[PDB]
């Protein structure tokens, strides 16, 4: 009875009738047409295990169970995903006209909606007037601009990030409370409000002259270092800013942003663009650390600490611990030797393809300090989901905030959807999101 033998979870192979051996081998051959095989055993004694589905990597216990599994959710979903991937991978190369359309659309997103040199002028003037206001109550401190205002990695409307440098014999919570009172009393601003629970504690106000929201922090040195590195890179390589803007807004990654962000998601996506630019062949951005450092070993790269910008062309590095390097400090060039001629459309498609099809996001670390590809284990970091090394805090995976189930699945979905959408003429995408871009 094939009826028993299809449901039996353990088969006495010797007790099988030659005709039953025949029928079972035929059934199994049929099951193979759906990726289901007898698992070869290690020490067989008619033992435990029967069938492996290579698609789902699922152990199945009998023939009837294999036929139920073929038609169930997991197997159907995997069949689909495999089909979608084959489609994505067999896409014909884009036409010159489609590439040009994409190129013009990307640069026009940056030009019509991005932060302009005159917009930076406005925001720097905001900082100058506010520093006038703050210092004439509190003269030791200084003000400076950071974040997107300088990097241009957000749109015309985005918030103005302003950091207060203060002396150590001055207490940070007290400092922000005093600043809150000062800005409340001063008529240059409206809607002055503390935001002290946010990831970075800040005072919020609206500059009445420019209508721009300002977020005033204190002692946020790391964010300023980060801003200066990314600003210098964007000034040296013209494709950096429009690719970051497209990646963030066209792919709809902005849907992740909230005002309690701390800007971490957008920072992650900027780092991902920079990583792609470093990892391209040929590359369009240099790596921050490498063989020009005499004695540099990619292992124990975590003994290095990146510092400020010099001449707007170099980033300082220190290695204060014992090591094989000749020098304790140095500087790395932020500029290639003319990674000359590739259109924005081609870069946009390549970037989408890199993250949709080509880079094993779950297995590696997005690391913008070295060119060598880091496995999770190289960092002794856990596997799964997204991993981005903060180049200025190297034990920190900044993408941990992307790694909720919702956001992770969204990011993967947006890569696939965007690539699918932009790879073929439908595309001069016109943004029209119905939400503020901060
Ligand atoms: Zn399956
Ligand atoms: Zn948006």
Numbering used by the authors: 254 to 578, 611 to 711, 720 to 731
Manuscript excerpt for this entry:
The terminal uridylyltransferase 4 (TUT4) and/or its homolog TUT7 mono-uridylylate group II pre-let-7, and promote subsequent Dicer processing, since pre-let-7 with a 2-nt 3′-overhang is a good Dicer substrate. Lin28 binding to pre-let-7 competes with the Dicer processing of pre-let-7, recruits TUT4/7 to the Lin28:pre-let-7 complex, and promotes the oligo-uridylylation of pre-let-7 by TUT4/7.
To obtain the crystal of the LIM, the N-terminal region (residues 1–252) and an internal putative flexible region (residues 579–610) were truncated from the N-terminal half of hTUT4 (residues 1–723), yielding hTUT4_N. The crystal belongs to the space group I212121 and contains two hTUT4_N molecules in the asymmetric unit. The structure was refined to an R factor of 21.1% (Rfree of 23.8%), using reflections up to 2.4 Å resolution. The Cys2His2-type zinc finger motif, in which Cys306, Cys309, His322, and His328 coordinate one zinc ion, forms the core of the ZF. A comparison of the structure of the hTUT4 NTD1 with that of the catalytic domain of hTUT7 revealed that two of the three catalytic carboxylates in hTUT7 are substituted with non-catalytic residues in the NDT1 of hTUT4. As a result, the pocket is totally closed, and the 3′-end of the RNA primer and an incoming nucleotide cannot access the region. The evolutional conservation analysis and electrostatic surface analysis of the overall structure of hTUT4_N revealed that one side of hTUT4_N is highly conserved and positively charged.
